[model samples]
Target: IGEGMLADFVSQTSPMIPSIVVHCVNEIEQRGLTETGLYRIAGCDRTVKELKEKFLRVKTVPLLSKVDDIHAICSLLKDFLRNLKEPLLTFRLNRAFMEAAEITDEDNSIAAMYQAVGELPQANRDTLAFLMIHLQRVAQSPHTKMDVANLAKVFGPTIVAHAVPNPDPVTMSQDIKRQPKVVERLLSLPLEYWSQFMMV
Candidate 1:
């Protein structure tokens, strides 16, 4: 089948949605994936190199499917999308968080911007929010510091496409470990700072 079939088949509980979104399958029609080259969808033909296979099969693999292991998950998903015949997010979607996250302005007031992003497809909004909130929470906590760092480094380029293409994850860890005041600066922002984005 195609993305249509695959999207239908995968349950809401599955981790595949992140893969779908990160691959820039922002539209509902583009959200599914499959093997055997369905000819319509992009992820159909590509391989999930970690499993020496595609996405559907990788779900059955032991090491490659763990959610707690964040680095491996993003890496594997990136590998799969990179191998797609017409890779998603490979060309465009290179937006930075601080920039795209300017969800408010004199013109696009907080209410306006919030409503605008609120209109996005569920997967599109969810994936972006998950990535963003995940970053903040990981940074917010004392534990999971290393995983956050590794993810910051590995997934940082994609998440903040233009600005941080080659950031070291360790730096993020160090910042968390050493720079309490720095985090406090972000923490200092009013609840609406991140809450507005997260609320939708």
Candidate 2:
């Protein structure tokens, strides 16, 4: 119950925790999983509640090591989200990934993306926007070697899914092209931005 900042980091990382986990898993395997360091430090503490409490102070997390620490924390976070009553973001996040699988840049536009934003509840769209921008800024950080291409690949599903709706749910159609148009969102970015992002 006394966990503080540790909780903040875990919560902040939730949106792309799965992506982080996948990256880390391979790293751990390549090195050969020989460490029980986090286990001992955590003292066999496996409870999701306790783990979240421990990670509250975000910066202080990654009990074992960077990637290894995230692998565990993300698992816990996913466990926590799955239990939420509403899980609005979880649903929206997954749904976006599906839409991303089929969405074509030619068939979609920035204006259409804006309409998608309008479709979300105010709170949902706000969270989504913050996360997207935060990821973008992370990519541009000079100090970090994190790959922009990898991030684009990792986040593409969730990002596009939110920006474009699937075929009209009300109608018995798989053709999203036929759906009624939505209001456009205004972002004065260069075409280069969407062109670059579309590669993901």
Candidate 3:
């Protein structure tokens, strides 16, 4: 009689249909539908007999068209979320970082800061590379633009403050023996920060 009743009857009668079975289970968990309600709506006693006859007649035709429709819908949802969320989140985090640091009207912005950091000490270079890989992944996900923004916020200040031109790496290396463990620290920070961001 109703959508609920129809679903119940279909589910009860077509127990061999994996999709219907899964849908029924999901309805039970997510919508809290009762077995009696499902049966009433489904007209299970009649539907089962009809479905069995239909299955015998059709010999279980593959539902490739339905599968394609489901896949398309899922893909659209993923793209919509990714495009809408990532850039906004990026802007928000960047704005927050600038606002919190009192960096309004500055000649250099966060983008400049990222570029600066990208060119900084060898250690920072490693950190940036590592961070970029994960940031790229976030950029690919739906509702992940904020993640990129947050990453820029977290690392922007450091890049702006310490990024210096290394005129000659050979001379610089000679001047600072043993490398001072810069790469290790640089690599560790991104992993630590990204881990914290994901947890939050």
Candidate 4:
């Protein structure tokens, strides 16, 4: 279902956002926001497969409201992000983001991140912003047990596409460390900073 560029999945019904994303996030907000372990808890493979088929093959969204498992929706959302032909953050910006994360100073790192985000196509930028904002709320509830750090750990690698074609194990480990910093910095920003990114 998530077989093309992020832009290809744009919602025919809504415009500007992927229908898969819109559906999953709506289900999460409505029912899963405060669910413990949220995205950390993996969903049932069979259920997730069914959901994916509905999106990619059936070309329709299942009634997530009727679905009993919140983790299935959460897992589905992450799968959609992970499987995109080009990742949500865009491959071109991956190195810039990692470099920004390497900056030791928080202010400088955040400024660099903003510049990197600016390089994303508008659709990518908007969708990333939308998901991050949703995640920020998810972290706000202590009951979800997912703070900015936890969410970043789960999402960082998922959000950023690997730019290097191949790398030694040493480099790969180090790269993983930098990846979460970019997501942590973005997720830590005050809600006001993200207002500009959201059209609605």
Whole-model lDDT values for every prediction: 0.35, 0.36, 0.31, 0.82
Cα lDDT tens digits for candidate 2, 1-200: 32221122233332323222333334433332333321112222364455555544242344434333433543453343333333323344434423433356734655445444556544344444433444344344543333345444333332332322333564323322322111111122233442332232
- Residue 121 lDDT in candidate 3: 34
Can you tell me which runs of candidate 1 are displaced by over 4 Å? 1-48, 52-70, 77-113, 144-156, 159-200
**Which pairs clash (backbone N, Cα, C closer than 3 Å) in model 4?**
none
Deviating ranges (above 4 Å) for candidate 3: 1-102, 105-107, 110-119, 143-146, 149-200
Q: What TM-score, computed on C-alpha atoms, does each candidate reach? A: 0.37, 0.37, 0.22, 0.91
Model 2 clashing-pair count: 10
Candidate 3, residues 29-127, lDDT tens digits: the string is 332221222111222334333333333334352322333123222222222222222221132233333232343433344433344344443322332
User: Candidate 3 deviates by what RMSD?
Assistant: 22.9
Off by over 4 Å in 2: 1-107, 155-200
Ranking by lDDT: 4, 2, 1, 3
Q: Write the per-residue lDDT of candidate 1 for residues 1-62, one digit (tens) a residue.
A: 11222233234552424444333222211211211111112331122243334344443433
Worst 10 residues of 4 by lDDT: 8-17
Candidate 3 lDDT for residue 181: 23
- The model with the greatest TM-score is 4
lDDT of 2 at 127: 41
